[PDB]
Amino acid sequence: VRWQQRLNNYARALQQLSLAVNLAQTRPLSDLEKQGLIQAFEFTHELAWNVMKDYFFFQGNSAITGSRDATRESFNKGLIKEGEIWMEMIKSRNQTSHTYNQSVADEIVKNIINFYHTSFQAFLEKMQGLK
Amino acid sequence: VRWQQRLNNYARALQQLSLAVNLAQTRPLSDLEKQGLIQAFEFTHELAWNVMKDYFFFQGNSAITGSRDATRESFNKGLIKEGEIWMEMIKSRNQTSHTYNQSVADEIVKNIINFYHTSFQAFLEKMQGLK
Amino acid sequence: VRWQQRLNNYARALQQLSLAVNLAQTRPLSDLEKQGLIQAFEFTHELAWNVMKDYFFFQGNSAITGSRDATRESFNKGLIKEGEIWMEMIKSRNQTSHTYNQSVADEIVKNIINFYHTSFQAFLEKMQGLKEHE
Amino acid sequence: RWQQRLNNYARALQQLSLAVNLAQTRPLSDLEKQGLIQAFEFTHELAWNVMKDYFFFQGNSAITGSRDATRESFNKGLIKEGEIWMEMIKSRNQTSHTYNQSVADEIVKNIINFYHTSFQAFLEKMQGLK
Numbered sequence: 057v058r059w060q061q062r063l064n065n066y067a068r069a070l071q072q073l074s075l076a077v078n079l080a081q082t083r084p085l086s087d088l089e090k091q092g093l094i095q096a097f098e099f100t101h102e103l104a105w106n107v108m109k110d111y112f113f114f115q116g117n118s119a120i121t122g123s124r125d126a127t128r129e130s131f132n133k134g135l136i137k138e139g140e141i142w143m144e145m146i147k148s149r150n151q152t153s154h155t156y157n158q159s160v161a162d163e164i165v166k167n168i169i170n171f172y173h174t175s176f177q178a179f180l181e182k183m184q185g186l187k
Numbered sequence: 188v189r190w191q192q193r194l195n196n197y198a199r200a201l202q203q204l205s206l207a208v209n210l211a212q213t214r215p216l217s218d219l220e221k222q223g224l225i226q227a228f229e230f231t232h233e234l235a236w237n238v239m240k241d242y243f244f245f246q247g248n249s250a251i252t253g254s255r256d257a258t259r260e261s262f263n264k265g266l267i268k269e270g271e272i273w274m275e276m277i278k279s280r281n282q283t284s285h286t287y288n289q290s291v292a293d294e295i296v297k298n299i300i301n302f303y304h305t306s307f308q309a310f311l312e313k314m315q316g317l318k
Numbered sequence: 319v320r321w322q323q324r325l326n327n328y329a330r331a332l333q334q335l336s337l338a339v340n341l342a343q344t345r346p347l348s349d350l351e352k353q354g355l356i357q358a359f360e361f362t363h364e365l366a367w368n369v370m371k372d373y374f375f376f377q378g379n380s381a382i383t384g385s386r387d388a389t390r391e392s393f394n395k396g397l398i399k400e401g402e403i404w405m406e407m408i409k410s411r412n413q414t415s416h417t418y419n420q421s422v423a424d425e426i427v428k429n430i431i432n433f434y435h436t437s438f439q440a441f442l443e444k445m446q447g448l449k450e451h452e
Numbered sequence: 453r454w455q456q457r458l459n460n461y462a463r464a465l466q467q468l469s470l471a472v473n474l475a476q477t478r479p480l481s482d483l484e485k486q487g488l489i490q491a492f493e494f495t496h497e498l499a500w501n502v503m504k505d506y507f508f509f510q511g512n513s514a515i516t517g518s519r520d521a522t523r524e525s526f527n528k529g530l531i532k533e534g535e536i537w538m539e540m541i542k543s544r545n546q547t548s549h550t551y552n553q554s555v556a557d558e559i560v561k562n563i564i565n566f567y568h569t570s571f572q573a574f575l576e577k578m579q580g581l582k
């Protein structure tokens with residue numbers, strides 16, 4: 057029940073992230089649109105690890121508390137394949153207060169486009185199949 | 188001095204937020220640009236309350252635990268005038284994981300444009316006068 | 319065999335749970351003893367579904383992500399008979415943080431004594447048999 | 453609201469306190485030792501959720517789980533004994549193994565000798581904060 061509602065909101069959020077990633081593949085993003093892509097990454101990643109946590113609670117695991125726990129357990133049980141990429145997302149979340157520096161904003165944007173988006177899509181497909 | 192270094196970065200972040208606020212006064216923002224305005228609010232507010240915390244720490248106050256404490260102390264010591272607006276900023280910060288919903292995003296955007304931008308400008312002028 | 323080694327630990331855990339259940343059939347438990355019965359249910363259920371997961375992995379099924387997956391597969395394959403009871407166990411596990419409320423503690427304790435203990439014992443017998451025959 | 457979470461924390465801690473007091477007066481049975489561990493687990497779960505709720509009230513919505521909450525509470529002075537609060541998380545992670553008498557005895561020892569006092573200090577600190 058609760059995990060499937062979270063999954064639906066995750067899909068909605070990721071759809072907005074995907075639109076921004078597809079726009080970035082068409083033309084360069086403005087500095088303001090880059091900040092918007094980073095915000096879409098923040099709300100998509102937040103939903104994603106909460107889908108993990110909710111799913112494991114549905115499975116009867118109430119030991120997961122945070123995003124690192126949820127990510128580790130997802131890798132251990134095969135919900136994700138790229139454990140290191142998902143751990144890197146947590147590091148990127150911890151940098152978003154520094155994106156008023158163009159170099160930080162560019163580096164997060166590159167990781168979102170080059171790695172995080174496809175990982176989000178794979179996780180969505182995996183959880184939809186479990187649902 | 189740390190709080191003055193923090194203030195210089197606050198000024199750079201506020202300059203970026205102001206570009207986006209001034210753009211929003213002249214035409215509708217796209218959905219992605221709205222999220223970027225929210226991200227610029229996030230990094231500008233995070234710098235602003237850390238200026239407050241650093242400044243009061245430099246004056247010998249070590250009891251500030253977070254942005255609400257910093258805001259309360261700034262109101263009591265005259266660093267801000269619009270106490271309720273700065274408290275509303277904290278409520279906005281705590282909603283940013285929900286900005287994939289249009290109702291939420293448009294509410295934060297409206298507050299940034301109508302109230303927070305000028306409150307940030309007033310704080311910049313106050314702190315520069317202390318520097 | 320890994321699932322058989324897990325089974326031995328499950329049997330040891332269940333022996334401790336049974337001591338407490340049989341004490342609870344004899345006199346009322348104190349509030350603290352009720353918390354202990356809940357903790358023994360938690361370590362016994364944890365072993366039980368890991369026996370399930372281990373067994374199904376040995377059989378060729380590696381798609382089990384946690385106790386609900388394990389319980390569904392055990393019910394489908396006949397390792398357990400009372401599917402609703404084992405699913406209620408998962409709801410009780412997920413109530414663990416709330417047992418400082420006396421009504422929650424009393425509810426889980428009632429379920430452990432009236433339903434879960436029997437199911438744990440039947441599963442032990444079933445898996446012991448699978449060491450020797452199908 | 454963090455203050456309602458704090459009220460529940462105080463209620464849970466009162467139960468743990470009565471169990472620790474009991475253990476100071478006589479040996480606990482094996483079943484009572486498992487109960488003491490369970491009461492530690494629901495008290496610790498409330499404690500780090502107080503920490504998370506409090507920092508959310510302060511405007512920090514980045515804290516996710518118990519390690520984050522404990523680290524931020526230490527950094528901001530809500531707790532002083534960071535090592536003990538980090539040991540509590542280690543003990544929580546051992547919960548499935550307390551049917552081994554040596555595991556249970558070790559957690560019980562830490563609850564009585566260290567965790568109870570730290571829980572009390574944290575209650576006092578948070579009460580002072582509102």
Ligand SMILES: *P(=O)(O)OC[C@H]1O[C@@H](n2cnc3c(N)ncnc32)[C@H](O)[C@@H]1O
Pocket residue numbers: 153154155157196
């Ligand atoms: P925030 O505290 O995230 O950033 C402050 C640090 O970034 C350095 N920095 C980067 N880019 C600049 C420019 N253009 N001007 C001044 N400082 C900059 C600061 O030196 C801090 O280390």
Ligand SMILES: *P(=O)(O)OC[C@H]1O[C@@H](n2cnc3c(N)ncnc32)[C@H](O)[C@@H]1O
Pocket residue numbers: 061065284285286288289290291
């Ligand atoms: P996130 O977990 O913040 O959102 C989940 C809940 O948001 C509500 N919701 C769904 N669809 C919308 C739209 N279009 N606008 C505003 N809010 C929405 C539902 O209650 C979700 O469960």
Ligand SMILES: *P(=O)(O)OC[C@H]1O[C@@H](n2cnc3c(N)ncnc32)[C@H](O)[C@@H]1O
Pocket residue numbers: 413415416417419422460
């Ligand atoms: P304590 O466990 O009372 O913490 C208060 C919050 O937990 C929720 N709550 C109490 N009891 C339960 C059960 N049995 N299941 C799920 N959630 C529970 C309250 O609603 C408070 O939010």
Ligand SMILES: *P(=O)(O)OC[C@H]1O[C@@H](n2cnc3c(N)ncnc32)[C@H](O)[C@@H]1O
Pocket residue numbers: 327546548549552555
């Ligand atoms: P039971 O859960 O004891 O399973 C038997 C095996 O689990 C390992 N084990 C026992 N106790 C612990 C703790 N405290 N932490 C991690 N692993 C544990 C041993 O390998 C047992 O033989």
Ligand SMILES: [Mg+2]
Pocket residue numbers: 094095098152225226229283
């Ligand atoms: Mg953001």
Ligand SMILES: [Mg+2]
Pocket residue numbers: 356357360414489490493547
């Ligand atoms: Mg327990």
